[PDB]
Motif scaffolding. Structure first.
Motif, PDB file in Angstrom:
ATOM      1  N   UNK A  95      -8.011   8.671  -3.789  1.00 59.07           N
ATOM      2  CA  UNK A  95      -7.714   7.422  -3.892  1.00 59.07           C
ATOM      3  C   UNK A  95      -6.191   7.375  -2.925  1.00 59.07           C
ATOM      4  N   UNK A  96      -5.560   8.399  -3.145  1.00 59.38           N
ATOM      5  CA  UNK A  96      -4.260   8.305  -2.129  1.00 59.38           C
ATOM      6  C   UNK A  96      -4.902   8.681  -0.828  1.00 59.38           C
ATOM      7  N   UNK A  97      -5.862   9.375  -0.626  1.00 59.59           N
ATOM      8  CA  UNK A  97      -6.382   9.758   0.738  1.00 59.59           C
ATOM      9  C   UNK A  97      -7.077   8.223   1.114  1.00 59.59           C
ATOM     10  N   UNK A 129      -3.068   2.766   4.657  1.00 62.01           N
ATOM     11  CA  UNK A 129      -1.731   2.515   5.296  1.00 62.01           C
ATOM     12  C   UNK A 129      -1.577   3.048   6.587  1.00 62.01           C
ATOM     13  N   UNK A 130      -1.733   4.293   6.558  1.00 60.59           N
ATOM     14  CA  UNK A 130      -1.549   4.994   8.021  1.00 60.59           C
ATOM     15  C   UNK A 130      -2.301   4.426   9.114  1.00 60.59           C
ATOM     16  N   UNK A 131      -3.597   4.545   8.963  1.00 55.51           N
ATOM     17  CA  UNK A 131      -4.226   3.740   9.765  1.00 55.51           C
ATOM     18  C   UNK A 131      -3.947   2.177  10.310  1.00 55.51           C
ATOM     19  N   UNK A 132      -3.117   1.562   9.420  1.00 54.60           N
ATOM     20  CA  UNK A 132      -2.651   0.410   9.458  1.00 54.60           C
ATOM     21  C   UNK A 132      -1.284   0.499  10.628  1.00 54.60           C
TER      22      UNK A 132
END
Length: 28
Positions: free
Chosen positions: A5-7, A13-16
């Motif tokens: 889920x964190x993944x 997030x990170x891809x954002x």
């Protein structure tokens, strides 16, 4: 596994950010 889920979260997030390590770049 919530780390998956964190993944997803980190993928949300990170891809954002566009690039995960640039999590700091967003801060720059």
């Amino acid at each position: 596994g919530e780390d998956l889920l964190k993944a997803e979260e980190l993928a949300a997030k990170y891809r954002a950010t566009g690039t995960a390590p640039k999590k700091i770049l967003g801060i720059f």
